[PDB]
Structure formats: structure tokens, C-alpha cells
Design a protein around this ligand. Structure first.
Ligand SMILES: *[SH](=O)(O)C(C)(C)C(=O)NCc1cn(Cc2ccc([N+](=O)[O-])cc2)nn1
Ligand code: NA
Length: 240
């Protein structure tokens, strides 16, 4: 997250860190959202490389033991069957990870609330991106979870020629684009939390930023629109 602030420890308890094995340790690669005690929602592209993954719930400071973390293996990866790693712009950038064990829920570990199927947010709706991704274009990961206010940019604006044009689809949510605040590398897969009827729900899965930079005016961060995939998510959980 570029231009964020440090999140309070208990603010976003559905946020997870998706990590892969690196030597004798682990490296953060993506965010995700805990959606059942044994399922995480992330971006398909986060699992394009075949590596050993783990999920960390209750994480805050990646480098220090907070006393709140639970670490769990990934037992099954279900990518959207229409995902094409060579065509991120086509959409379908979503995957479900079945965890090897069910995590314990507490003030630091909670299920993310998903929107009703079909929900589309009005332009400029209030949302926050969270993650440990880079804090500047070409920078380094955040040690502590970051948040930034990123109001939505509706499909009509986001897919117009001065924004993302045809690259953005109606199956995506755009947010931000103010040139100061944005998602960045390593936020991918994580949530966009939007306030609807007094409750935050996870409307986006961070999917891509501009190759010209993370925080670029009129290149808002682009998310998979969770509400386009409710039936798919439920079908996967029910059949696995
Ligand atoms: S996102 O918008 O944050 C985006 C697309 C810029 C991003 O940074 N995604 C992160 C990501 C994770 N993966 C999978 C992966 C690739 C390579 C390794 N590796 O060890 O070399 C590990 C994981 N791709 N993009
Ligand atoms: Na920690």
C-alpha cells in the first residue's frame, strides 16, 4: 500500500498473509481474506507459481511475533476455471485455498463478510485497501499491515479511454487513482473493504496495478469484483 497509514492491530481480522517457502524461511507474496475457518479467498495469479504455501491469520508485524498469529498449510487450491495467467485483463482473478486445519476465531481472526451477489457500488463509494505490499513503487514491503482510503471509480469511468480502457471489465472494481494512495506489489490477493449499510464487506480481491507505477493518476488499483463470484465461491465450498 502506497500512501497508507498503519492499521490498528484488530481492525481487519479477516486479512491473511499468503507466504511461500524461501530457503529455510518464508516470504510474503500476497494477501487474502479468510472466508471460512478453513477457506481463504485470494487472487488466482498469487498461485500461478507452484510453491509450498502457508497462510498466516492474526498477523500484524511480519517480522516479529505478535502473540496472535496462527500458521496453517494450504491443502487444496481451487482457481477459477476460466482464469488465464496470460490474460489478467480477462478477469477471473480469484482462487480459494482450503486450509489444512481450521483456524480458531478471536478478536484477531474473523471471517470476512462478502457482499450480496450482484452488488455494484456507486461511484466514489468508501472503501479501504489493506496489505503488506510495497509502500512505494519499486520499494519494499511494509513490516506492519497498512490501510489506505481508496474510494471506488465506477465501471463507466474506469473503462474509459483516459483510465484503463477496455482492460477493465464489469467483473472488476476500480478504486483510488488519486496519484498518492494505491495498492502495490504484494497487496494482490487481499481485500478491498467497503462500507455498505454500516458494515464493511470485502468487495474486491486486489488484482493489478499499472506497469507505470502503483500510485498513478487515473490508473486506480483494480480488484476482482467479489459480488460477481458468490455462486462460484459457494459452489466450491459446498463441493469440497
Ligand atoms: S498486485 O496487484 O499486488 C500484483 C499483480 C502487482 C502482485 O504484486 N502480485 C503478486 C504476485 C504473486 N505472484 C506469484 C509468485 C510469483 C513469483 C514468486 N517467486 O518466488 O519468484 C512467487 C509467487 N505473482 N504476483
Ligand atoms: Na507477527
Amino acid at each position: 500500500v502506497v500512501g497508507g497509514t498503519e492499521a490498528q492491530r484488530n481492525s481487519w481480522p479477516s486479512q491473511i498473509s499468503l507466504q511461500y517457502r524461501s530457503g529455510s524461511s518464508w516470504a510474503h507474496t500476497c494477501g487474502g481474506t479468510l472466508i471460512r475457518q478453513n477457506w481463504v479467498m485470494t487472487a488466482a495469479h498469487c498461485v500461478d507459481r507452484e510453491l509450498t504455501f502457508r497462510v498466516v491469520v492474526g498477523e500484524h508485524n511480519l517480522n516479529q511475533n505478535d502473540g496472535t498469529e496462527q500458521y496453517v498449510g494450504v491443502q487444496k487450491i481451487v482457481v477459477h476455471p476460466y482464469w488465464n495467467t496470460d490474460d489478467v485483463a480477462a478477469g477471473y482473478d480469484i482462487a480459494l485455498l482450503r486450509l489444512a486445519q481450521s483456524v480458531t476465531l478471536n478478536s484477531y481472526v474473523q471471517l470476512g463478510v462478502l457482499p450480496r451477489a450482484g452488488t455494484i457500488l456507486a461511484n466514489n463509494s468508501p472503501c479501504y485497501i489493506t496489505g503488506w505490499g510495497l509502500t512505494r513503487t519499486n520499494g519494499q514491503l511494509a513490516q506492519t499491515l497498512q490501510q489506505a482510503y481508496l474510494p471506488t471509480v465506477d465501471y463507466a469511468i474506469c473503462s474509459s479511454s483516459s483510465y484503463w480502457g477496455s482492460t477493465v471489465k464489469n467483473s472488476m472494481v476500480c478504486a483510488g487513482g488519486d496519484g498518492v494512495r494505491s495498492g502495490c506489489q504484494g497487496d494482490s490477493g487481499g481485500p478491498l473493504h467497503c462500507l455498505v449499510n454500516g458494515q464493511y464487506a470485502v468487495h474486491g480481491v486486489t488484482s493489478f496495478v499499472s506497469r507505470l507505477g502503483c500510485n498513478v493518476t487515473r490508473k486506480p488499483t483494480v480488484f476482482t469484483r467479489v459480488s460477481a463470484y458468490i455462486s462460484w465461491i459457494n459452489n466450491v465450498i459446498a463441493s469440497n
